[PDB]
Amino acid sequence: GVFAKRTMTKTRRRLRDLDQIERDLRSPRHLQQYKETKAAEDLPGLGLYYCIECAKWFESETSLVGHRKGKPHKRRLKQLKEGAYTHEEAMAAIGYRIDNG
């Protein structure tokens, strides 16, 4: 079930994208900037329990561990294993390239 499914596609209800999550997994600096754009005291569990793949904060370590067994986390893992869609893949799909000399 999705909370308030009617307005789910609004920009003010937007969630973090899969390629951003891929860059977060590859580079801790990217994740650090994303976490800097938030306030730690307003986060669940003071921000101590975070799932990078789902880009989600949890209230406790047991909550995070229990979430890992669910199918949404496994869907995110399968999507990351398949690979996020990027501008490089979009360019390769039409056979376009970048000439830098």
């Binding site: 005291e41 307003d42 986060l43 904060w57 209230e59």
Partner: protein, 43 residues
């Protein structure tokens, strides 16, 4: 924040309701639920 987390005064996402807890504290102060007094000046 600690009073909000202890009393369960949480918004969506577990964020503490600091506004409501402050209103509770002010009401308790005004309505004689927290002890306080102004001591008399010494002669």
């Amino acid at each position: 924040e600690m009073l909000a987390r202890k009393s369960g005064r949480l918004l969506k996402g577990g964020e503490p309701d600091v506004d409501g807890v402050a209103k509770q504290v002010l009401n308790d102060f005004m309505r004689g639920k927290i002890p306080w007094f102004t001591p008399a000046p010494e002669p």
